[PDB]
Design a protein around this nucleic acid. Structure first.
Lengths: 80, 96, 104, 93, 96, 80, 104, 93
DNA sequence: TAATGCTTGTGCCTTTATTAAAGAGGAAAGTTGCGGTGGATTAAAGCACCATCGTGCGGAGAATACGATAAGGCTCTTGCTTCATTTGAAGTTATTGACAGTTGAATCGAGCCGCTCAATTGGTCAATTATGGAGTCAATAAAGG
DNA sequence: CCTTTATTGACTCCATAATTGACCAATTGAGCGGCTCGATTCAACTGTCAATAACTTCAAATGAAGCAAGAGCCTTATCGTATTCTCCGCACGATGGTGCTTTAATCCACCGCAACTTTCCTCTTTAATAAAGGCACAAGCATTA
């Protein structure tokens, strides 16, 4: 598993921007978005892995992710 | 043949993608990315599918909000094209 | 054998809410009127949210409530959006809003 | 194992509100999680209020103050009115 | 006589004010404002002095942070003068 | 107690801006700042008054203000 | 008659922290090693913050620590600023930071 | 009524850190408030951790996981190392 | 304005799967008795907030000349959109194996409860020394030449 | 680069109040013992996560125009700024009143414990109907003329 951050293709970023209301997009927006997404994922996955490590488990469940998101003030409904 | 002027198809795509509610990132690449990212913390980790789905939904919502803020910053500068400095400014103001 | 929900004129489980308050160990003792008040508040909030979601569904010519309608109702109302500013609704989409400058 | 939720009560409230409008299972999940979150917020706020004044009992006053501190504006005012009505109806019965 | 060019005295004031830690709003006007604002919630309220001091310190810190964000927004637009639209944009991005 | 928001004079706003690193200030910044400050004060004072009322008191202390500030993620040290 | 703080090689009141944990009703039961761990963590954090504040005071040619120095130490460090991002320090002031474009 | 604070212990730690540097009363107030705030954060995190897994007892594991969840990065790593050292020294005595 | 491509919303047939509906029991809610621990009441006193009053200045308020920055407009070129072609990897189906998460019991380790006693810590008082303020010098920095 | 003038760190001397130390109360931490329970380990079972393979095929990659938006430069004006004069209300020191905060004792009332009964909700199973998919059609929007 190496260089999989490139799996977030340009059309995916463009579609995400269009959903957000962006009309035109620059060139380095893709790299900037990939870096930002990597940082966010690193934080959330670290918290989820800590939560699942505490319970002496090894499979990360949806509840761990929900708790990790809630700890950042990003509460998510629909996965309770 | 027939060609649209620039920005018309972009406006149509903005209208179309804000109506629907499905996911926009392909599922398998995101699953691979999440697995690689988690491999840095604890090896031999297994992910329940619902956890990956929740992560994808949260990431997409966060990116959409960030792009809304970026568009606001770009409009503030008398521009219509978002730029990396807009993302940096929005993240800095948000406290990230 | 009258349920406390019927005694207080409510539809929510006053007894179950009292059991939740006791089990959560929020305090060593819990008053008799606290579960009734909590049930009334929760029922009112649920009724308000369901009212707004049902209205949004009706304007869409749909006979059922879906997470898109709940998201629309939450975002279209000021106080609920204030209470749910950070909330992410699964399959909720976004509230359609295009900037005036971007229009031709 | 038995999993307790608010599905039946939410359905009853919806049928009181919209007689001829149905709901989806995902909507039940979202509503149940929302109600659980609100309950948790109010309960922790009431526990904090009880801890501040060294009162070992949670009463309707603590729940009312938690509602005023958490819910905003007219939502809080309406919630307090409904809660007071329910408490008086329970005590007078 | 002798006159400084515009912006030099402003730079000196910027250098001088960030060095000190004292309060910048006059105490009595702020106390009167806080009392008037609280009169809208309950009449016949008495304010302990330390409460007023804490309110003043919090308000000054909040305003300084808001002005830092406003300066960032104004710099982003190739300007040196802060404008009300900068404050509005900073507050909107912050979530207020 | 009427029109006391004008007691936040222009020099006070200018000093606050200078502390924040602002080099030039426009004309309507004063009115905008006064409105923002009024909103912030209204929220914090409302929460402090609620905290005071729960204790069946008539005097607002520093602890109520500290708790109200902490409720908004603006924790203050030095008034404990 | 050996204090638990001396037994664990700490300076922090292990017994007082245990009493705080028990009185706060954070849980039904409290283990024997939880107060020791909590005291060690609190002592380490206090030592780190005091180290940074004392260094900041020394660079200022002052022989005493004041809230200005504590603010400087907190805002000059990365992880402490992450932990204290929303914290407002009384009589702390701000870090001198003028934008490059504003300079002549 | 007597008040309880960490002033003496903060002074001892400072004298360990800086032998010839004093401190002001306002600095004691700020340090005491900071220590109290960290204590509350860690305690509520441990209580949530115990509630999640239905364990009625909060042991050193809960405190360690709360430290990892709250403190960031190298600060958390150093704090965990110090806590483990202290717990091991206590148990070995 | 106008014909035309053209993408979207409208409307009907199917179908499936997602919601509507019923029973056993089993898990939990309502009853009753008890009693002691917490909450409401009462009385007092003391301390901190309020309000008056003098004052005498430093900071706020207004005018004035102005010069520097914001804004509008022209140019241009290069970066970003749109459309045709091709393929390479995602989504789905069906199968399988083995690890990991749950549930149930024994039990031995462990933290709570109760009382004792002793000792660390905290409020109060006495003190002195780094720090605050005043006044002056030398270094630093800016503006017109 | 230079001179002149304004600004501020450095330096010293004096006041001061603010931090340091001692005492003695007084509150609470360490000790010891019994006891009930919980968390540790062991064991089977079962749920599902990971891995393989093949098939399709549509969305991503690439390239060729196409073109219009960002940016640089010039010009104008108007508006925040620095400086001087005037006044005004704020911070400070003193004093007096009082109400409202806090503490102590009492009485009563009300909620946790516990066993019991009964009752309402929740998996498992059966059914059915409304929204998604598909196919055909209208219809307003954009585009170059």
């Amino acid at each position: 598993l190496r260089d999989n951050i490139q799996g977030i293709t340009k059309p995916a970023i463009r579609r995400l921007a269009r959903r957000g209301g962006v009309k035109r997009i620059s060139g380095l927006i893709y790299e900037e978005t990939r870096g930002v997404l990597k940082i966010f994922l690193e934080n959330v996955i670290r918290d989820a892995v800590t939560y699942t490590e505490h319970a002496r488990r090894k499979t990360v469940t949806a509840m761990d992710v929900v708790y990790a998101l809630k700890r950042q003030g990003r509460t998510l409904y629909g996965f309770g | 043949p027939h060609r649209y002027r620039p920005g018309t198809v972009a406006l149509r795509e903005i209208r179309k993608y804000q109506k629907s509610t499905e996911l926009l990132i392909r599922k398998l690449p995101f699953q691979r990315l999440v697995r690689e990212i988690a491999q840095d913390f604890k090896t031999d980790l297994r992910f329940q599918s619902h956890a990956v789905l929740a992560l994808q939904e949260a990431a997409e919502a966060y990116l959409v909000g960030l792009f809304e803020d970026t568009n606001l910053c770009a409009i503030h500068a008398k521009r219509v094209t978002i730029m990396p400095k807009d993302i940096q400014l929005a993240r800095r103001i948000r406290g990230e | 054998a009258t349920s406390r929900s019927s005694k207080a004129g409510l539809q929510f489980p006053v007894g179950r809410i009292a059991r939740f308050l006791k089990a959560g160990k929020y305090a060593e003792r819990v008053g008799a009127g606290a579960p009734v008040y909590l049930a009334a508040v929760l029922e009112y909030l649920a009724a308000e949210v369901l009212e707004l979601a049902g209205n949004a569904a009706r304007d869409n010519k749909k006979t059922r409530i879906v997470p898109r309608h709940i998201q629309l109702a939450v975002r279209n109302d000021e106080e609920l959006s204030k209470l749910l500013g950070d909330v992410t609704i699964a399959n909720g989409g976004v509230m359609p809003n295009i900037h005036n400058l971007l229009l031709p | 194992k038995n999993v307790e939720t608010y599905k039946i009560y939410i359905f009853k409230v919806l049928k009181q509100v919209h007689p001829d409008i149905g709901i989806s299972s995902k909507a039940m999940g979202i509503m149940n999680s929302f109600i659980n979150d609100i309950f948790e917020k109010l309960a922790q706020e009431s526990s904090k209020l009880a801890r501040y004044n060294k009162k070992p009992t949670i009463t309707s006053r603590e729940i009312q103050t938690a509602v005023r501190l958490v819910l905003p504006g007219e939502l809080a005012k309406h919630a307090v009115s409904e809660g007071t009505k329910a408490v008086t109806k329970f005590t007078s019965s």
